[PDB]
Design a protein around this ligand. Structure first.
Ligand SMILES: C[C@@]1(C(=O)O)CC=C(c2nn(C(=O)c3c(Cl)cccc3C(F)(F)F)c3cccc(F)c23)CC1
Length: 241
């Protein structure tokens, strides 16, 4: 009956509709691991082919997060400048959080192109430190057994942050943020999951991880430009031109 219970339902629905793979499918595929031969095949690929593959997967992941944001109550009513400020700053942070679902803490593997593989699958990219950081981050969230609704509500808060520099209608973003904060806290209380609050990553950790990741993608894009499937001209302009 409350606006808050409806907000939880709407955020979770927006999330279910914008999540590429179902949790059940990711969990059943846990036993489907790349063989020693398949790993070698990925390791032998050119860094530039691995870059193209990864850039396609990441672009697609970002577009689903943009669709997720568009479905958040009041996001569409924000001015274009603020929608772009929030997505530029937060869309990749949401992508990085969403990765924990495809991460298996038991063998330190991630679901990539149909099977589970370790960080050694990405050797040709020559990004070992960055990839270890992404794996470590996914591990910290996966150890919490972060539920589907916890991911939906937490990633809505990653996006709707009134502290992002450059916002023009801060008060409008704050209104949306307070309601989502209440929705998250109300949901954790009901499910007896408030204990994860002290275990979540410090905000600065996600920001720094995302800045390092985006900086690396920008270096690859400068050296070897990809043909990007662009759906959002104002957002594309901010990241690529
Ligand atoms: C959604 C999109 C469009 O369809 O118009 C525009 C922006 C994208 C994006 N890319 N991106 C990347 O990091 C990225 C990606 Cl996802 C792939 C290749 C290159 C890059 C980049 F920007 F670094 F050059 C973002 C980071 C934060 C917010 C972002 F929105 C992005 C992807 C496509």
């Amino acid at each position: 009956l409350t606006e808050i219970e409806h907000l939880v339902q709407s955020v979770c629905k927006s999330y279910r509709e914008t999540c590429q793979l179902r949790l059940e499918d990711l969990l059943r595929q846990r036993s489907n691991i790349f063989s020693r031969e398949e790993v070698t095949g990925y390791q032998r690929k050119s860094m530039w082919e691995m870059w193209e593959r990864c850039a396609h997967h990441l672009t697609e992941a970002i577009q689903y997060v943009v669709e997720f944001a568009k479905r958040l109550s009041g996001f569409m009513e924000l001015c274009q400048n603020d929608q772009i400020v929030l997505l530029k700053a937060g869309a990749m942070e949401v992508v990085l959080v969403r990765m924990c679902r495809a991460y298996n803490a038991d063998n330190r593997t991630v679901f990539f192109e149909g099977k589970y593989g370790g960080m050694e699958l990405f050797r040709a990219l020559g990004c070992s430190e960055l990839i270890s950081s992404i794996f470590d981050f996914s591990h910290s969230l996966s150890a919490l057994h972060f539920s589907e609704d916890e991911i939906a509500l937490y990633t809505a808060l990653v996006l709707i942050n009134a502290h992002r520099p450059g916002l023009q209608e801060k008060r409008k973003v704050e209104q949306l943020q307070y309601n989502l904060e209440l929705a998250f806290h109300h949901h954790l209380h009901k499910t007896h999951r408030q204990s994860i609050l002290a275990k979540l990553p410090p905000k600065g950790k996600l920001r720094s991880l995302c800045s390092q990741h985006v900086e690396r993608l920008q270096i690859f894009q400068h050296l070897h430009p990809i043909v990007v499937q662009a759906a959002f001209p104002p957002l594309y302009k901010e990241l690529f031109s």
